[PDB]
């Protein structure tokens, strides 16, 4: 019967729940007691970018760590310049509802997300001075939540019908379809070697896929509510999720289990974005209690909160040289802290 | 002004770009957005067959119809077979919510289960929408359509198989009015929003006049907060 095969699954679930306990001889907070604290980290609003007229929904830095795309729900997708506050391009979107954006590693393309589940790819360094659509990647059935770029020809889009997909761009088709979730996928992020990628779903589950083959290598269920944001430790051996449990949990990829949760008892609102700093010491996190707390990533204590936003904090990003962080809020201002 | 010859031309672009957002934010904020909720079979595609002026977009189809110099925008969220808790905050700041309930759903049972009749199904859909934390100051236009189908069904099948404690007669005027006040007793927020119901027919032309009369209310009520009277 159906229960006869599901009893094997609960036994296999009891196998892997047994193996993680056989390895956790001493947690993170007992092995790094003999470290110095990082001290208070106060960061001043160096720039502020005030072009949009709606809620900023996502952002992404270019890998030259100067340009910066930001996408709001008034149907605009503005490519800022972070050193001097300039708008390089203002790309008018076809569908005004945009739930994510992502900039190219080469600096050539930019792809809006969408609530109309079509991940349209824009071309920047083009002839004729425009920014026209390169290709619209229809084929999901839900909505779209986070779509990072592998390179200029492969884009990994999470969706809202529990299917993370990998597209080609010279042709419009998919190549794989990473299925295996139950609640809809809310965010993803690629490893620094772009061979693996994690994806935080809505059933308190985060799965480490692989890009080539297309199967889930490991799953990580540690939360209670949905996982709302995800990011990598900058070597690709650990990743931290963010939830509506107000708890950034730092997992890893070679010991299968959760290393540390970053909980504070005074915070009750969710997490919307998580981004590690470079060298992986300062885990930033953006709650929707209007703050943006800055957690040490090896001891669970806090540091200087980045207050200053009059609404939610919807997107973060540390530049690839680790220089600045920029937060995009639900009032229209981005603030490039430093 | 300590800037190079090209960088002086760069901020000339970024104030010509900034001019084309502030002269476009003053075009979208003059126009009225309208979420269009309801069940997928409850006459949802009929009320966009009233006035329609504007295949890949399987998620959200817009309808940019206008009336008496007012560019409305209806957002049919029909293709979203996903969790409403994750994208409904995108629609915070909508001007009014056009909800729809087929009036013939009192006796018509749900498809997947022979229980939780579609009037009770649409009521619990309406209670989650109306009392949502993102929709407080947004009024709810509620259409009761299929009213040319309802009044000849209650003549031959009673209403009390949907509501257990009705205790009333079986005319169209007194019973459909009970369903109408059945929905308006669902808001815990009584004075921060006002449900403008309506019994629209399938053939009449009066509902687009009605939705203009209920947007002119909530635009006025959105202006009383900004001017300081309310």
């Amino acid at each position: 019967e159906l229960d006869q095969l599901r009893q094997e699954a609960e036994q296999l679930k009891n196998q892997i729940r047994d193996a993680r306990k056989a390895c956790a001889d001493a947690t993170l907070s007992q092995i790094t007691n003999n470290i110095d604290p990082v001290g208070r980290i106060q960061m001043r609003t160096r720039r502020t970018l005030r072009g949009h007229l709606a809620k900023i929904y996502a952002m992404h830095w270019g890998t030259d760590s100067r340009l910066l795309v930001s996408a709001s729900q008034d149907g605009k997708l503005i490519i800022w310049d972070s050193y001097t506050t300039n708008k390089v391009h203002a790309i008018p979107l076809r569908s005004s509802w945009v739930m994510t954006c992502a900039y190219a590693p080469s600096g050539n393309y930019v792809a809006c997300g969408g609530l109309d589940n079509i991940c349209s790819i824009y071309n920047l360094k083009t002839r004729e001075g425009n920014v026209r659509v390169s290709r619209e990647l229809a084929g999901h059935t839900g909505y779209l939540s986070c779509c990072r770029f592998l390179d200029d020809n492969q884009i990994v889009t999470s969706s809202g019908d529990t299917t993370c997909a990998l597209w080609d761009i010279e042709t419009g088709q998919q190549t794989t379809t990473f299925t295996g979730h139950t609640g809809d996928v809310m965010s993803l992020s690629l490893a620094p070697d772009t061979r693996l990628f994690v994806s935080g779903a809505c059933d308190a589950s985060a799965k480490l896929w692989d890009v080539r083959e297309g199967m889930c290598r490991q799953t990580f269920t540690g939360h209670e509510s949905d996982i709302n944001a995800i990011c990598f430790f900058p070597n690709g051996n650990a990743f931290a999720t963010g939830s509506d449990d107000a708890t950034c949990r730092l997992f890893d990829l070679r010991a299968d289990q959760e290393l540390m949760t970053y909980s504070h008892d005074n915070i009750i609102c969710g997490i919307t974005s998580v981004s590690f700093s470079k060298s992986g010491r300062l885990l930033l996190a953006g709650y929707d209690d209007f703050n943006c707390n800055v957690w040490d990533a090896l001891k669970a204590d806090r540091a200087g909160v980045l207050a200053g936003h009059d609404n939610r904090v919807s997107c973060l990003g540390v530049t690839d040289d680790g220089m600045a962080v920029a937060t995009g809020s639900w009032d229209s201002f981005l603030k490039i802290w430093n | 002004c300590t800037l190079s010859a090209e960088d002086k031309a760069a901020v000339e672009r970024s104030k010509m770009i900034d001019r084309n957002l502030r002269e476009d934010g003053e075009k979208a904020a003059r126009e009225v957005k309208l979420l269009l909720l309801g069940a997928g079979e409850s006459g949802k595609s009929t009320i966009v067959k009233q006035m329609k002026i504007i295949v890949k977009t399987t998620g959200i189809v817009e309808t940019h119809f206008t009336f008496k110099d007012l560019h409305f925008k209806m957002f049919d969220v029909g293709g979203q077979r996903s969790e409403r808790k994750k994208w409904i905050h995108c629609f915070e700041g909508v001007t009014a919510i056009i909800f729809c309930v087929a009036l013939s759903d009192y006796d018509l049972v749900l498809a997947e289960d022979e229980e939780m009749n579609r009037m009770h199904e649409s009521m619990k859909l309406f209670d989650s929408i109306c009392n949502n934390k993102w929709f407080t100051d947004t009024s709810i236009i509620l259409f009761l359509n299929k009213k040319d189908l309802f009044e000849e069904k209650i003549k031959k099948s009673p209403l009390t198989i949907c509501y257990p404690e009705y205790a009333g007669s079986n005319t169209y005027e007194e019973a459909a009015a009970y369903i109408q006040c059945q929905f308006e007793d669902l808001n815990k927020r009584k004075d921060t929003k006002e449900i403008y119901t309506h019994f629209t027919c399938a053939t009449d032309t009066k509902n687009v006049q009605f939705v203009f009369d209920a947007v002119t209310d909530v635009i006025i009520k959105n202006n009383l907060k900004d001017c300081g009277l309310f």
């Epitope: 100067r66 340009l67 310049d81 300039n86 390089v88 391009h89 600096g107 360094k125 002839r127 004729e128 001075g129 425009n130 | 300590t2 190079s4 010859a5 090209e6 960088d7 002086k8 031309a9 760069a10 000339e12 672009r13 010509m16």
Partner: single-chain antibody
Framework: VQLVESGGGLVQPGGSRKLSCSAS????????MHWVRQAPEKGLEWVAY????????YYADTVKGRFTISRDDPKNTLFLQMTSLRSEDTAMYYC??????????????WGQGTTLTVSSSDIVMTQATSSVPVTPGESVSISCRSS???????????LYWFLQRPGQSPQLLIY???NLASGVPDRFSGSGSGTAFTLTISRLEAEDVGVYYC?????????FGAGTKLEL
Amino acid sequence: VQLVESGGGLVQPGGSRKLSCSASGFAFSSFGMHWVRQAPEKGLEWVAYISSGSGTIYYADTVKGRFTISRDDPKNTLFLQMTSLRSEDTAMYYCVRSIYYYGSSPFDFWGQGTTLTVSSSDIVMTQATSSVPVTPGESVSISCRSSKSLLHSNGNTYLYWFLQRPGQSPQLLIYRMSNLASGVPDRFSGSGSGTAFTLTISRLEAEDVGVYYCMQHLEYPLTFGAGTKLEL
């Protein structure tokens, strides 16, 4: 994409002639147009400029006040009206385009060029070479020394190199410094020093013949150099 232009012919001095540049193929309203002339024995000199949306208009010193410029965005045409020309304005006039943001490539596409024939504080750029002979295969370098320090205070050394194959219209080679334009091979590579510059060709073939104008862009008026000819 092209910028065909018309006008000119033969004009009596002191008169006037309206020069039109009908730019068809792109989005015109985002392109700050210039106007560069070429005397029939001399190099290139800058003449005019109008920014995007007709906001900022500069001029050269020689043509200040007597040359007026205008843009027509819906008619998609660019107008240069010349009042009371002298005999020192007989030249081929080029209608070039340029868009200015971070990481752009100004002066990228140059028009075909019309002829205008008459009847009878700024930074200088020298080019110490003139008319070098070169066989295909030898790595040749072209020097171009400035006078002011072209390195600004944000890392940029605004020195746009160029090329002009004989007969035809010029084209970009190297924008700001050691950046390649869209569609040039990897043989051309520049290396700067703030005042002294060098355009290195690693390997070269028979299509790379012509003159090589180095042009600054640090402040208006932007002066080309007297370019070095390449022969066989």
